[PDB]
Design a protein around this nucleic acid. Structure first.
Lengths: 50, 205, 156
RNA sequence: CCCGCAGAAGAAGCACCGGCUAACUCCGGCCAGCAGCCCGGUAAUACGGAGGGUGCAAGCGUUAAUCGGAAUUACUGGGCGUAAAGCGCACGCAGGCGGUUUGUUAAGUCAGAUGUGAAAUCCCCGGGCUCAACCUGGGAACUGCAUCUGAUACUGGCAAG
RNA sequence: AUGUUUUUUUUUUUGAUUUGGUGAGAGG
DNA sequence: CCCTGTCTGGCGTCCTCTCACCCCTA
DNA sequence: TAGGCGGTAGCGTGCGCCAGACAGGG
């Protein structure tokens, strides 16, 4: 739930390179962040450090 | 002069979410966004070069809710102007009054914003502008007039926007219900998925 | 990282005592979105195998091209057998103005902005070859400076 | 032009879906029919109807006509052994082109200026009709012609080699 | 000596290593 | 201010194995 | 399908040492 304790737009995506909206599942044409949920399609290891 | 039919059908045909519905409810719930419209939806063969260009053009067109002659007009204008053509065309499309409104968050959809514009709700620099295709110019303030200020649909649109990401090239006030179009947007500020260069090529046949 | 486009596929026949044996030719081209480009022309009894071969061949014998940022460095002509090709550098935003096989090779090459006409034959195979030739012969400013014993600013 | 009234109210069709060419299925016998070029003889994505789609939209199609694509008369920009294309062979007037050096001229050529090249149209920056079309201020352009003043590498003229 | 003498049936493509705690039992 | 009592904070072996249990009531 | 003694009070009660600060008595 946005934006409670477990979040997605504070702490990052749950899955690897898969945003919460569903826009992007790539890593070749990466770097670009999401617009719907605004979740930077990156890695889930970043939920261990944010 | 407008597309009055099903909206999600267009989205399905394009493949992507075109934001033709407000965004309270997710698109996947409302429709089979992956599957193309009609009896022969599940079948999906690789398109042609011309065809992909055409689809891209359609996507953009559908996003903004313009019709073909008008786009051709926009494109020729962009070509005339200095600088990158596709970028120019995108800027032109953005400058449309109804799109501007939608970005503000006074219309849930772009269609809603267009309707507002038509119904003498919006003012540009304190003068009521009715044309959705009206190209808004830098440092132009654009506001809701006092009559239309009481509408519930406006505040709902504003809330939806607040959920949505805010554009940098604008500055809007939710209490005053007026926003300043500070500058014409940069290509970076816009969505990356749009392949302007295909559009350009399409008309450079 | 490499992108690959099958330009064309064509059925070709061989007459034998029994009848006609059919086969398929696949013309593909591959590139890394930078200078480097390579075409392959494969043949097999079935289509997918032939395109696989085309990809394999293209992947080897690639060729480098000196790109000024998104476009070319100067107008260049290239020919092969019937297909005679003109292509001209163009301003950012214009896109690839080119027809058919030629287009494809340009895209994989990572040129984004060209004005380009194929005179003469438009036989995909020959025209792509001609394109490749025009791209190869095209030299850069630094290259010409080196050739001529000068600095880049001298040449401008 | 502005204000007030009511109520989704009065307001969407045309072409196409074999490939070129975006869009596919079912039902009806080389007939009936289609067709721009390249289907139909009983499982037609090509005829007709339906459903579904695609593209345009107060328009949509067809026909006619022009340029384009056509580098398919090729100045830019094609060719001629076999694809169309070398006169059967020569001489030779007109015509076209013309080794090398110096001098001179300044016709061609180039540079600058002046005069003109109507306005409108086109293009650039602006302004005004709510926007646009439209109207409109200023510029640029009108690639030219004529003159005057220079330059003299090249081409030409004249004079000597 | 002779053959333009019965015209007819098949183009392109979807997924490989996975999972927690507090307490009573119990081997040195 | 100089003791002297009270108070509340710290700490109290290692490794392994097994088992149950992990809201019901309004 | 939805929330933190359960009650018109009282539950706690079987470790022990050391130590250092906070304060009581004089």
């Amino acid at each position: 739930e946005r934006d409670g304790l477990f979040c997605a737009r504070i702490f990052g995506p749950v899955k690897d390179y898969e945003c919460l909206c569903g826009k992007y599942k790539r890593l070749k044409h990466r770097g670009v962040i999401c617009e719907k949920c605004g979740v930077e399609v990156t890695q889930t290891k970043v939920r261990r450090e944010r | 002069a407008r597309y009055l039919g099903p909206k999600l059908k267009l989205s399905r045909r394009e493949g992507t979410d075109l934001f033709l519905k407000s965004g309270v409810r997710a698109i996947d719930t409302k429709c089979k966004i992956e599957q193309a419209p009609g009896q022969h939806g599940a079948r999906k063969p690789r398109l042609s070069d011309y065809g992909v260009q055409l689809r891209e053009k359609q996507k953009v067109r559908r996003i903004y809710g313009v019709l073909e002659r008008q786009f051709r007009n926009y494109y020729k204008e962009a070509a005339r102007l200095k600088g990158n053509t596709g970028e120019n065309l995108l800027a032109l499309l953005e400058g449309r009054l109804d799109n501007v409104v939608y970005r503000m968050g006074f219309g849930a959809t772009r269609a809603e914003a267009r309707q507002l514009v038509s119904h003498k709700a919006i003012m540009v620099n304190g003068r009521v502008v009715n044309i959705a295709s009206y190209q808004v110019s830098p440092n132009d303030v654009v506001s809701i007039r006092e009559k239309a200020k009481k509408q519930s649909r406006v505040k709902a649109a504003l809330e939806l926007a607040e959920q949505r990401e805010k554009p940098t090239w604008l500055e809007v006030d939710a209490g005053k219900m007026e926003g300043t179009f500070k500058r014409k947007p940069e290509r970076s500020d816009l969505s990356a998925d749009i392949n302007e260069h295909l559009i350009v090529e399409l008309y450079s046949k | 990282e490499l992108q690959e486009k099958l330009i064309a596929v064509n059925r070709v026949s061989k007459t034998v005592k029994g009848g006609r044996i059919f086969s398929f030719t696949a013309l593909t081209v591959v590139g890394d979105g930078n200078g480097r480009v390579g075409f392959g022309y494969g043949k097999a009894r079935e289509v997918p195998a032939a395109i696989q071969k085309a990809m394999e061949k293209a992947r080897r014998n690639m060729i480098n091209v000196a790109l000024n940022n998104g476009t070319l460095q100067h107008p260049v002509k290239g020919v092969h057998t019937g297909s005679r090709v003109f292509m001209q550098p163009a301003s950012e935003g214009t896109g690839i103005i080119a027809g058919g096989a030629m287009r494809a090779v340009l895209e994989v090459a990572g040129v984004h902005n060209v004005l380009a006409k194929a005179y003469g034959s438009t036989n995909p195979i020959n025209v792509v070859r001609a394109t490749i030739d025009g791209l190869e012969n095209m030299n850069s400013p630094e290259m010409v400076a080196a050739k001529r014993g000068k600095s880049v600013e001298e040449i401008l």
